[PDB]
Write a protein that binds this ligand. Structure first.
Ligand SMILES: Nc1ncnc2c1ncn2[C@@H]1O[C@H](COP(=O)(O)O)[C@@H](O)[C@H]1O
Ligand SMILES: [Cl-]
Ligand SMILES: [Cl-]
Length: 643
């Protein structure tokens, strides 16, 4: 593939160049020079060379990384205090500080868990279901899996019971690991899954009455079912495992399975993308899209069931950084947390960018004043958010997993004063592009394929359009126990069919348009990329979330609009008034974005209850789950069409 390079091949497939990445290397140097924490977190090139020695097993390179960085802080989690009220009841409360686990302590805990589990009869090749958010304990379980040679199955916490149990039926795990938050759901699925011999409970504080009561109920229910099963805290497994015989070394075969990452298509049937040893190793050896070498204080806010949660976690550790956990699965502590973390690197998803923009808009509305213009006030607010909310040390930032509007790219770059990288990739393919430019490696080949029923052709003007298809060094081997499904997503020439419509701006230079299945045809022949519309309309200060909906029988669009709480409160006493103001705001967004008139929803339902991951309307990446939204709002929307 070096021999398919041309003079038109972007350097950006390799290197990011402009006069200023001397200015960023300087700006990085400045942030480091008044910050003792950051000095000690630069990557060690001796540890990197050991980790990248060719021919290493995955456990050997994991060992060289974790033992190599030693007592360096790896994982930061918010400290907790046990509060015992005057009645005797004890709760766990967060403290306003973080504490850390070192690289070698992570390794020691992993080896202890593997020893304890092996003594409990768990073996290399067993599947391990894991139900939780993302946390230090979860990271310990993940590395423990690599050490024992099991297959991690991180389950989506918002998935239906029926589908979770079917995944359990298919993987027959011998271990079910659950954070205390999700223990009741765990017991339901353990009772349905007789293969489980061990229930391992993590993120667990037994001195808190509620955690203690959750565990007693677990033991009560599993005993009533007559289940022979070991119920064991991760903390005690670690304590006891420190003194037990070492687990045997795990299988060495690079193709041995180590992780499944589930994903759903338009059918809503999850399928498990297989991650073998060699593909897991890629996550730990190569940070997605490095702008340049920086001390890495990162933020984990995405679940371990999603690739993006692994990109921040293993990306940060790969280069000797410290990865800090958001303390709430619903992100309610997000801004309190990052103000304490003060990260140097943030990998956003669009939903979280939209939350930051809303925070800014609400602060602006509260700060309006006759003696300064909105732009003047907005500038001061951005300084404050950049310095106080984000910590003032953000040096690298980016977004991926879903499209991000040009307006939000510009806003985040202005707010954070860094370039906002756009990272496109998938669970299946791995990393595919950076700011539109195909990354070679791992990508080796791409093409676009016409989608004539959506009006996309490689001969379109000004840009070729069609479905992106790719070959890549990090292409997954397939979906677990779904060979026909896997064959179905590779075309006759072996290209992976991304299901994404793109435009080719230039050789190796692409623009995301939408999912094939997201594009709607209106009655008169127009085609609409709904997720672009949703990204634009969400930017209205009145709008918190939006779901755009159409019917090919109709000439126009509808939507479901969740207003911001500030908007609802401002018109609480004038109910009639909010809907026409939202409509006018959509019209104005459309004119600013140069959208066509058919791209403007002509009516909508006002929803006061935001879509959530817990409700199944949002994916664990907080993207819309369109079949679930059409399942939920479809009758009302068609009734809005019909009358
Ligand atoms: N930077 C990105 N920009 C636009 N869309 C993205 C980006 N990253 C992922 N997507 C979408 O997310 C899909 C992968 O989702 P998943 O396999 O569940 O992680 C891709 O096929 C795209 O549709
Ligand atoms: Cl379902
Ligand atoms: Cl003004």
């Amino acid at each position: 593939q070096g021999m398919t390079e041309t003079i038109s091949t972007p350097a950006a497939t390799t290197t990011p160049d402009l006069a200023d990445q001397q200015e960023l290397e300087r700006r990085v140097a400045q942030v480091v020079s008044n910050d003792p924490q950051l000095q000690a977190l630069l990557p060690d090139d001796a540890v990197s060379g050991a980790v990248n020695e060719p021919g290493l097993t995955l456990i050997e390179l994991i060992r060289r990384l974790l033992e190599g960085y030693g007592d360096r802080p790896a994982l930061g989690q918010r400290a907790v205090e046990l509060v015992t009220d005057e009645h005797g009841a004890t709760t766990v409360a967060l403290k306003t500080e973080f504490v850390t686990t070192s690289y070698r302590e992570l390794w020691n805990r992993a080896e202890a868990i593997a020893a304890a589990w092996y003594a409990q009869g768990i073996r290399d090749g067993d599947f391990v279901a894991q139900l939780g958010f993302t946390s230090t304990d979860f990271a310990s379980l993940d590395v423990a899996g690599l050490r024992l040679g099991t297959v991690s199955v991180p389950l989506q916490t918002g998935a239906s019971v029926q589908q979770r149990n079917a995944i359990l039926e298919e993987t027959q795990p011998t271990v079910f690991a659950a954070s205390v938050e999700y223990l009741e759901a765990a017991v339901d699925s353990v009772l349905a899954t007789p293969s489980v011999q061990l229930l391992s409970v993590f993120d667990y504080h037994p001195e808190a009455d509620a955690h203690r009561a959750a565990l007693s109920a677990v033991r009560d229910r599993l005993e009533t079912a007559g289940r022979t099963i070991t119920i064991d805290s991760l903390g005690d497994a670690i304590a006891r495992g420190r003194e037990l015989p070492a687990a045997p070394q795990p299988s060495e075969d690079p193709d041995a399975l180590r992780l499944l990452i589930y994903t759903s298509g338009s059918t809503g049937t999850p399928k498990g993308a297989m991650y073998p040893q060699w593909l897991v190793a890629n996550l730990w050896q190569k940070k997605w899209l490095t702008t340049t070498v920086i001390p890495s204080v990162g933020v984990n806010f995405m679940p371990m069931s999603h690739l993006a949660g692994r990109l921040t976690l293993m990306g940060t550790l790969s280069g000797g950084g410290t990865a800090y956990y958001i303390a709430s699965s619903d992100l309610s502590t997000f801004f309190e947390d990052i103000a304490l973390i003060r990260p140097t690197e943030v990998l956003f998803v669009p939903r979280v960018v939209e939350m930051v923009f809303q925070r800014y808009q609400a602060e602006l509305d509260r700060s309006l004043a006759p003696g300064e213009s909105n732009a003047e006030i907005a500038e001061k607010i951005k300084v404050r958010i950049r310095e106080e909310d984000f910590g003032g040390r953000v040096l690298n930032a980016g977004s991926g997993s879903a499209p991000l509007s040009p307006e939000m790219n510009d806003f985040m770059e202005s707010l954070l004063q860094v370039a906002m990288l756009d990272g496109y990739g998938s669970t299946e393919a791995g990393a595919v592009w950076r700011d539109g430019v195909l990354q070679r490696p791992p990508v080796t080949e791409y093409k676009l394929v016409d989608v004539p029923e959506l009006g996309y052709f490689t001969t379109d003007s000004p840009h070729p359009r069609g479905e992106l298809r790719i070959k890549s060094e990090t292409m997954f081997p397939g979906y677990y126990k779904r060979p026909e499904t896997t064959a179905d997503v590779f075309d006759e020439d072996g290209f992976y069919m991304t299901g994404d419509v793109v435009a080719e701006l230039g050789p190796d230079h692409l623009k995301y348009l939408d999912r094939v299945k997201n594009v709607l045809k209106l009655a008169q022949g127009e085609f609409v990329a709904v997720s672009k519309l949703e990204a634009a309309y969400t930017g209205s200060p009145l709008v918190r979330q939006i779901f755009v909906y159409g019917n090919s029988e109709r000439s126009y669009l509808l939507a479901v609009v969740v207003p911001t709480p500030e908007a609802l409160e401002r018109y609480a006493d004038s109910p009639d008034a909010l809907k026409p103001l939202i409509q006018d705001s959509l019209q104005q967004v459309a004119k600013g974005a140069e959208l066509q008139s058919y791209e403007i929803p002509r009516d909508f339902i006002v929803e006061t209850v935001p879509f959530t991951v817990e409700s199944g309307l949002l994916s664990d990446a907080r993207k819309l789950l369109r079949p679930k939204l059409k399942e939920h709002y479809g009758e009302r929307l068609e009734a809005l069409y019909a009358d």
